[PDB]
Design a protein around this nucleic acid. Structure first.
Ligand SMILES: Nc1ncnc2c1ncn2[C@@H]1O[C@@H]2COP(=O)(O)O[C@H]3[C@@H](O)[C@H](n4cnc5c(N)ncnc54)O[C@@H]3COP(=O)(O)O[C@H]2[C@H]1O
Ligand SMILES: Nc1ncnc2c1ncn2[C@@H]1O[C@@H]2COP(=O)(O)O[C@H]3[C@@H](O)[C@H](n4cnc5c(N)ncnc54)O[C@@H]3COP(=O)(O)O[C@H]2[C@H]1O
Lengths: 204, 205, 203, 206
DNA sequence: CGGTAAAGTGACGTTAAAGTATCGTAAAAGGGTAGTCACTTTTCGG
DNA sequence: CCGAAAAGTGACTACCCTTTTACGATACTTTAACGTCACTTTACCG
């Protein structure tokens, strides 16, 4: 997710304090070791954060001395740009997460289409008396009705051989079997009957 | 297609060009660069090798980095930016997004035919139908499936009739069963027993 | 959680057994011959034959080959394989994947929109570097607007900003007034700079 | 872009000949080196192509007797089966080209947006001013006109500092400089002036 | 009171460690190769 | 004319080579800490 440098984190924190006014312009800061203990960091790590601010003309520290705040206006500008552009950073990170996730989806797609082709080949390899099958997952006035109430053969030309409901099968279902949403209908007919069944159950 | 070494180069060229490093001021070479940019000394060294190759600085003094000319640093910045991507980078990203949008449209249509080329989905379950040859005399011959009311008589769902070697799939109630036809139907073993009895086939094993 | 060629071998051989092409008594060819017929490794063929062995469709205690065991259990295995593998279920997954990818790209499009909006355009760090003069000398051109002076036609300069009493107006237009002591920021070349200096009596 | 084993090619070729009738049913496909010489291929790749044929039950094999042709109807059916499924597989191979190019453009997008962030922080470190740069790449009633004819400052609030045309820059352009399609316009102003310039030159660009 | 020297503290620079990424090597599998094995056909001899 | 032997070819198999994928190791980069150096302040002495 979001990771920044600890050095940067310290720099941003102290720059925010300066911009808020805790450290006024011209405020002395003979520091290193004291603020290092405030931040529970090695005294040396403190400078790693405060000379980056000096080259950026936010403060001035002579050798062996304390940091003197220089420009309120420029420290404010820098802190603002950094935080709003670290929001630029968070948006950037979300784009990289999104594109990597999409590469993950497209890799799954690759294996799916290879697997799809493999199954189409293996399924064709038999041919005893293959029937036609659909999943009635869309809303339709034909759901919650029995096969006889629908009068299926007269509506679509299909002969239903089996209904799968909640993973269970009824073969040779008869007129009293009910077709419910999500059920699988196995049926025989030709390509036109398959097309009729798809339209009849609002499947495309 | 770029690494942060270029960014270092631009940053230090910017300092030189603004006048932050006065004309002829010396840097502490790798140590100063690493302390400033947080970049490693090995990348930094190539970063400054860039400005050496363009004569913005000289490194023949192991001590550090001597800056040479502010005018050449400004030249560097300009050509660098123009040959790289800034407002072009915004345009390139837009072009990339639109190219991928078109590629996805092509993909959507490809898959449509791929899926529609499957004009049906089969199962090859054990639901494959029993086959009986109605070769014996029977009161049921010469009648239509609907007149017989077959499912209610035997529990069978007829999927096809073979008559004179020709098949009718999904036969409906008006198809007639004639002597010698083959009836294909789904059911279980008990449905098979009912069909065999119904059509006077008790002789068959 | 379903990817295998050995399963394709398993179903193929089970379909042969169940249809009756391979009678019960009959022996299958060598594990190496089946691997070559199905164009795969002997090891994957070993997995396929182990599948039907675990389902008691074949036994391999003989080196000559695999002996067929049960035609009905091959049929029993075809039913279970149908369930596990699934047919249009596979197609449906591809449609869902495509739909999810389209939504992910819509999210990406909007993300980039804000990223690019930012708030403004950009910069090319050009030597456009605008000149600055301070109009501190007396001049008949002071107390006049940029349009009244017709500056570009007089000096070749394009004024980008005026500083007046320490405050800035950027893109000033023809109605902005140049007063004594103001700073004029402008673009042009060295000759334009020279014209501006002379024009405002800065020699 | 085609990856069918050599064996499989050999099988298809000889099966096609059988289905055409060049190799009749009782006629024996004898001479294995002689079959290798027919296609100038190795005799063992040919022998195995024929073996895969024999195992799909198109021809029968036996010592001393060249492969005898068994069934016309089934060899014909199998030829047609390979004809459909192989093009199905080629269509599958196509979606692969799409996913590959798109993954490449995503890896490309990732680098582009990383550098875009790099540019934003780099330009945030500016000097007195950074003029907005627009590329007038869209069709517009304003193209082919001079800055003075357009009366740009009064239309948009922008002061144009330079035009880039055919890679050449004119600084301090004046009213007689013309804006042509594809030019880069550099101008000063604020965020609102930028919005006016973008609208004025038909750059909504969604 | 002024100057000098010493000590202490803060900063800067350099080096080391840890984590992540990339590349190379190795292993496994899938597909082609020649050697061997057997069977059938042809020729010769009885 | 029939039988036997030899030769040629089909059938068989163990193997080898090539390609792809996965894992491991090395390298690089970033962040932290130890050490050393400089500057400032104080105290003491002249
Ligand atoms: N292929 C077949 N196999 C076995 N028997 C068949 C049959 N076709 C028709 N019948 C029999 O004839 C009756 C009328 O069939 P019909 O198709 O007109 O009218 C049918 C049909 O439109 C529909 N239906 C019933 N089962 C169906 C199924 N499995 N598939 C499609 N439609 C079915 O409900 C109506 C009443 O069905 P019900 O079973 O009470 O009554 C059925 C049934 O006893
Ligand atoms: N670089 C530019 N960017 C944007 N628009 C430009 C432009 N150059 C010319 N125009 C537009 O064309 C009009 C006539 O410009 P011209 O240079 O002849 O006549 C100008 C010019 O001599 C002078 N002027 C105005 N603004 C100026 C400026 N920022 N710098 C220098 N001269 C300016 O006053 C006259 C009237 O100015 P006004 O703005 O009413 O009208 C301007 C303006 O609308």
């Amino acid at each position: 997710e979001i990771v920044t440098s600890k050095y940067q984190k310290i720099a941003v924190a102290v720059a925010q304090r300066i911009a808020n006014g805790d450290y006024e312009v011209g405020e002395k800061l003979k520091s290193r070791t004291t603020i290092a203990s405030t931040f529970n960091v090695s005294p040396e790590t403190a400078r790693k954060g405060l000379n980056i601010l000096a080259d950026l003309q936010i403060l001035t520290l002579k050798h062996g001395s304390g940091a003197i705040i220089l420009s309120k206006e420029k420290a404010i500008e820098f802190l603002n740009q950094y935080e709003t552009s670290h929001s630029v950073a968070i948006l950037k990170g979300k784009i990289r997460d999104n594109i990597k996730a999409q590469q993950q989806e497209m890799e799954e797609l690759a294996t799916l289409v290879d697997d799809f082709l493999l199954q189409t080949r293996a399924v064709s390899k038999q041919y005893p008396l293959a029937p036609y099958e659909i999943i009635v997952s869309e809303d339709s006035e034909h759901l919650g009705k029995s096969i006889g109430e629908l009068n299926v053969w007269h509506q679509t030309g299909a002969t239903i051989v089996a209904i799968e409901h909640e993973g269970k099968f009824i073969v040779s279902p008869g007129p009293f079997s009910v077709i419910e949403q999500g059920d699988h209908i196995f049926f025989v007919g030709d390509e036109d009957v398959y097309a009729r069944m798809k339209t009849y159950f609002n499947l495309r």
